[PDB]
Design a protein that fits this description.
Chain A: This is Spike protein S1. The complex is a heterotrimer of chains A (193), B (216) and C (213). Chain B is an all-beta fold and 216 residues long. Chain B is built from 1 helix and 19 strands. Chain C is built from 2 helices and 19 strands. Classes of the chains: A mainly beta (193), B mainly beta (216), C mainly beta (213). Chains A and C meet through loops of A and loops of C. The structure holds 2-acetamido-2-deoxy-beta-D-glucopyranose (NAG).
Chain lengths: 193, 216, 213
Amino acid sequence: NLCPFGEVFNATRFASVYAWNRKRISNCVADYSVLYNSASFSTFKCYGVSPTKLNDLCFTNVYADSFVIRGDEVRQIAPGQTGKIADYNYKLPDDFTGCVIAWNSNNLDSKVGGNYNYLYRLFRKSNLKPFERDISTEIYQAGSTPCNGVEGFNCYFPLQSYGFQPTNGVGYQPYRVVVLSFELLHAPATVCG
Amino acid sequence: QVQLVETGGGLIQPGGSLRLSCAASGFTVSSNYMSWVRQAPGKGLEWVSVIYSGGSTFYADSVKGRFTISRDNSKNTLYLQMNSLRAEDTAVYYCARDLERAGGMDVWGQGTMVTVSSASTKGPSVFPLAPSSGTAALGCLVKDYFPEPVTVSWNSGALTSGVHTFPAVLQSSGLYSLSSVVTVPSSSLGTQTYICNVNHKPSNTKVDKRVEPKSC
Amino acid sequence: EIVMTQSPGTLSLSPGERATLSCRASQSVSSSYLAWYQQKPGQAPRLLIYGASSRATGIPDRFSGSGSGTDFTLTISRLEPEDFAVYYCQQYGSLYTFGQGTKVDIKRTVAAPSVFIFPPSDEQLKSGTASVVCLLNNFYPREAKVQWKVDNALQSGNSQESVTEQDSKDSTYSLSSTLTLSKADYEKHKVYACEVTHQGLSSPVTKSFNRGE
Ligand SMILES: *[C@@H]1O[C@H](CO)[C@@H](O)[C@H](O)[C@H]1NC(C)=O
């Protein structure tokens, strides 16, 4: 039928960035008309693809990844970036082909007194490879003494809360992000405009 | 057990180069957010550079393209390579560990001093600040020396009461200037000798200057 | 560039009083990314508070923190003699920036400075430069203005100031101001005056001399 973009975009819940959600889009026609011609997006940037041309193309599969970050971090959802999000939460490859879409969701995802449901990974020994998803909750060992599952000095829970409050500045407000990857394989195409 | 110790500070010329080291104990440098923070004489704290556990580095605008932060995991040591140094890089450089929401910058070193100057070593000229014709005030103006520090005493250490030795100021010429004064009973001006002892080790200069009322 | 501004610049209190230091961010930042540090002369900073209100390890209970949005507060409920130092706020949500700091003063009754003026010595004059020195002795509080006048012309941009740390016994400050001229210009003028303004003076006090006398 029609590719179920609404299930992704108009979803009541969104994932924390460290456990970002991925929907696989196959065997349907995708019209990007609603997305490119909606005035409700803070960010709509495409790489290796032009948005108008999207309805004139065909891919093996499309991937829709979804999560929440803060505004100042949306710039890290792009090829070749660095920072806590790009390094330890969600990493785009340098040859990325697809589009990043983001919109302010302060009305949905912020709570007076702090919304502590949305998390980000703060500690990680090494960088993420592109499209890697790390859901570990092992205690982070910042020294040479083993932590053994208990928090303490040099032994920290690797995930931290954003604590979105509606009073935050726009750079610290939650933004919902959808990353569309258009994958080109040597196989029959199943997603078209 | 937890210790950050900075080394490598010294005097260097503008356009020069220097590499600061920060040896760590009690935590692993490569496992942490590690920062350099500097403090110019008499001013506040200015963040300089940071390296993430994963290798990402970031820099303050005032050092971009001139400073480079790095680390050696084998020696558990953080480094700051500083090129094209300017006079305003003169500061104490601290090395610090950051925990962000998990606990801020909880571990600091005690810092190493970096001085960037065109000036060559030069001993101070010592002039009297003569009491004018209750309380009398007299002193010594210790002018045009480099580098810091100088030490000033009065009567070879016997006279300490009422002595104020002021922090040096850096002059437009790149040389330092300082004053040390003392208030005494006016009557004492007739019965007591006052000599200021100025020692500047970097030029091995030692001056003993007597300060007396000028005669009208 | 997030700018942090602390207020006031100096806080004057006695041991046992309550200290309230304010920090304002130029942009709204989450309380998650706010910290307070203490610094004593010659020592490195020491973390007091992280995440706006969480005390760090070892920090006594008299230290508390609060705030949100652009305004944050550090509170020392009852001041101990150890608490007299400088305090910086910091945001660490977008790299790191600090405030200019707030100094906590040992308070005492207002005391006016004793003012002295020193002409240049003949020896320094032989070398071609003239340094005139004005001393402000044992005053409280630190705020003090020194106005150099040369033949009643207000001088600006040719003097430098220095201030001592608060005295450990009488808790006063001292200041020294130096006016520097060439001998050629020093000998073009007669009256050299230093005018001092301070809370303990109902009127500005002027100390002067005439060159050649
Ligand atoms: C989400 O709901 C709005 C309003 O009904 C609709 O216009 C939009 O197309 C929906 N989401 C998408 C893009 O499918």
